[PDB]
Design a protein around this ligand. Structure first.
Ligand SMILES: Nc1ncnc2c1ncn2[C@@H]1O[C@H](COP(=O)(O)OP(=O)(O)NP(=O)(O)O)[C@@H](O)[C@H]1O
Lengths: 183, 62, 50, 366
DNA sequence: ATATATATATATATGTGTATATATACACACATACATATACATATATATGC
DNA sequence: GCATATATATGTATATGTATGTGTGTATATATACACATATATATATATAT
């Protein structure tokens, strides 16, 4: 990949025992010991000279970085991307979530409320997720611009609700919303 | 049935019947050659070029 | 995410209640002491402290 | 095998063990009839075929000759570089044994009444001129892969290596290269197209010859394939990708059978230098079917498309220009700068940890 | 037949609130593990040995 | 036709040496994203007109 971007002009003089595979003599099949003894070319300074040179090295760098993009772009297995993370890290996934029951989701506010939520809930029916801060102006907004925020999208992700159609595939049956008791 | 009779040739008849190993390519073909420093797609017969280059390399060897 | 366990919650007045359905491709040892040694090796219920 | 139309020499035993090659086939036989030297010496058939060069049964017409041999020097060249060489020939009535030794400097022919019909060449190679001493496992692996490829080309001839049978099918051989290789078999051609991620890969066979350096045939086949594929990829994905950029990602395993008037630039026959009209008339390969079959596949062409747009996006992202008096080269948002910094001066850089401890600095400093 | 006069919703932004998170050094003296390889025993088998 | 023998190949089981901890908080700082509105501003889109 490095050496395919070079045009190399070699001129070899006074060579000894020049063995060839053909009558046309297009391929020097003399052994590498004799040629390595005969050729006294200092390739280290040529490497230093193309090191100091810039407009040969920059196509090497650009083609190399595009080659690494093509290398680690097309890899890996288990390409079944429908849930990269199961629910949310902060989400309390109920044991009968996803199936037909009275499976209830808790939309609390603040992660510091996460204490005691797991302990005395229903493990099969109750589930939870803490919200963050305050809520956007969701009224009369385009779907593409409300989809770009994570904290409203995950609500429509942890549950199969999609903005464009009705609700049929509810992972949580009831939605219990609890807010802070102040203003 | 393919006729297979062992015939023994001299030097001249074996060269003229089997010219491929002795002058290389004897057909008009397309390659990419540096002409005047330019990597240009040429199309020619390498046998005639080699035929001139035998005399040329003989003179340089002299 | 190895096809061996499927865990769920069964907590209450005490925490850390996990109900785990093992999968059919995971081997249940009929040797119960080997079961105990392997569940200690994998689930890591013994915490050793100096 | 070909000269008897695969009735004879239909089993070929190539046994390579302990620096000794024994190739036995059940062909009709190297003829016992009288052949004549130009020197005047009356030499019988197999011994003139196996001792002196420039002798053989391929000096006839070339336009009907479908065999891989032209030069008449080959088995004599095998005899020359061998320290021991026995050729046992049966035509059905007599067994001619041609035994040569000491680098064919000892040669003797002998005739026994017998009933075998075939050829057995058993030779031990010379190692004095070659830069080796023994036949290692890579040579046997190359020979076994060649017998596998020949059994793919010729399924009727049962090649065996060291007493072990070889099955040759083009489908399993083609999936050995790439498991998503698109295949296409004809009456004389058999081509498989796969993927080449680390350079360009090729393998081609004219009749029974491994022409590893190429020929006119692969150039004409890739020209006919790209002449259909390049306007097709132009209408499909609107990208200007050249012939060589498409071709270098492909591994092409094409097989040519029953060629006529094959010419080669060397004795080793590694480049088919027949005229392009001859190969274009002989090869009836349907390039447009291969073109649509690799268009409809998402695993070969679509990687070339995504790699090409990766190259173009990496080219588009590298955009830069100049700036008017750049401050401290790569500057920082919180980095206040001395105005004589960088030039020939004694300028000092300040390192603190607080943003409150620099809001007083800009007045009290130089 | 496009140059320009002009009009109007984009971008901070102010302060108040209400809530998140994150890179690190510290160090034992183990804890769990991450493979891991590696050397050696023994099995069968098959091909030599008889 | 049958003894047999040893050879190497693969289980296997341990024992190596590492590798990653994070521990468990202290400690240091910093970042984040929203709701509440008028006031400009700006910049570019359309009309027209000769
Ligand atoms: N093992 C063999 N099986 C069949 N024919 C053989 C064998 N060995 C030699 N011959 C024949 O004996 C003759 C000797 O020719 P040979 O020296 O082998 O050259 P060739 O077959 O023309 N190969 P080449 O010189 O490389 O083009 C030919 O007619 C061969 O076909």
């Amino acid at each position: 990949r490095v050496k395919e971007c070079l045009t190399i002009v070699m001129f070899v003089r006074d060579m000894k025992n020049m063995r060839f595979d053909s009558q046309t003599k297009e391929r020097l099949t003399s052994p590498f010991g004799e040629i390595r003894s005969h050729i006294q070319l200092d390739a280290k300074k040529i490497s230093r000279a193309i090191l100091n040179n810039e407009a040969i090295l920059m196509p090497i760098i650009e083609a190399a970085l595009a080659r690494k993009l093509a290398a680690e772009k097309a890899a890996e297995t288990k390409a079944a991307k429908k849930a990269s993370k199961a629910k949310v890290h902060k989400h309390i996934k109920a044991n009968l979530c996803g199936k037909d029951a009275d499976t209830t989701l808790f939309l609390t506010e603040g992660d510091s409320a996460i204490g005691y939520l797991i302990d005395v809930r229903d493990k099969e029916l109750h589930g939870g997720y803490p919200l963050r801060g305050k809520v956007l102006n969701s009224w009369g907004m385009s779907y593409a611009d409300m989809l770009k925020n994570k904290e409203l999208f995950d609500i429509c992700a942890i549950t199969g609700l999609v903005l464009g159609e009705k609700a049929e595939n509810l992972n949580y049956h009831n939605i219990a919303i609890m807010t802070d008791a102040d203003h | 049935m393919i006729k297979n009779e062992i015939k023994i040739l001299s030097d001249i008849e074996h060269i003229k019947k089997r010219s491929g190993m002795y002058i290389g390519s004897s057909a008009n073909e397309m390659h990419e050659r540096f002409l005047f420093g330019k990597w240009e797609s040429v199309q020619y017969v390498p046998g005639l070029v080699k035929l001139i280059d035998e005399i040329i390399d003989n003179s340089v060897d002299e | 995410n190895k096809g061996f366990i499927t865990w769920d919650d069964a907590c209450g007045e005490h925490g850390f209640g996990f109900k785990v359905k093992f999968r059919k491709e995971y081997s249940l040892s009929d040797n119960e002491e080997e079961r105990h040694a392997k569940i200690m090796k994998d689930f890591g219920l013994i915490e050793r402290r100096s | 095998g070909i000269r008897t139309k695969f009735k004879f020499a239909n089993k070929i035993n190539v046994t390579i063990k302990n620096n000794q090659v024994t190739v036995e086939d059940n062909g009709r036989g190297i003829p016992q009839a009288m052949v004549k030297t130009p020197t005047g010496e009356e030499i019988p058939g197999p011994v003139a075929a196996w001792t002196i060069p420039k002798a053989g049964g391929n000096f006839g017409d070339d336009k009907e000759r479908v065999t891989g041999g032209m030069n008449g020097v080959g088995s004599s060249l095998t005899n020359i570089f061998s320290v021991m060489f026995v050729g046992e020939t049966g035509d059905g009535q007599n067994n001619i044994v041609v035994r040569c030794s000491n680098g064919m400097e000892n040669k003797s022919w002998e005739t026994i009444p017998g009933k075998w019909k075939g050829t057995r060449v058993t030779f031990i190679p010379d190692f004095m001129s070659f830069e080796t001493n023994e036949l290692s496992q890579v040579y046997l692996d190359i020979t076994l892969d060649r017998l596998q490829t020949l059994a793919v080309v010729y399924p009727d001839i049962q090649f065996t290596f060291n007493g072990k049978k070889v099955q040759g099918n083009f489908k399993k051989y083609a999936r050995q290269y790439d498991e998503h290789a698109i295949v296409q078999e004809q009456e004389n051609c058999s081509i498989a197209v796969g993927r080449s991620p680390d350079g360009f890969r090729q393998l081609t066979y004219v009749n029974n010859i491994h022409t590893k350096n190429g020929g006119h045939h692969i150039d004409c086949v890739m020209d006919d394939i790209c002449e259909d594929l390049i306007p097709q990829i132009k209408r499909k994905f609107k990208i200007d990708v050249t012939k060589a950029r498409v071709k270098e990602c492909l591994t092409i395993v094409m097989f040519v059978r029953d060629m006529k008037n094959m010419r080669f630039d060397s004795q080793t026959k590694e480049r088919l230098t027949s005229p392009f009209g001859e190969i274009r008339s002989h090869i009836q390969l349907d390039a447009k079917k291969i073109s649509r079959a690799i268009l409809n596949n998402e695993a070969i062409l679509m990687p070339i498309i995504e790699a090409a747009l990766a190259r173009k996006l990496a080219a588009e992202k590298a955009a830069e220009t100049k700036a008017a008096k750049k401050a401290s080269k790569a500057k920082v948002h919180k980095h206040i700068k001395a105005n004589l910094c960088g030039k020939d001066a004694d300028t000092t850089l300040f390192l603190t940890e607080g943003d409150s401890a620099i809001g007083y600095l800009i007045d009290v400093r130089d």
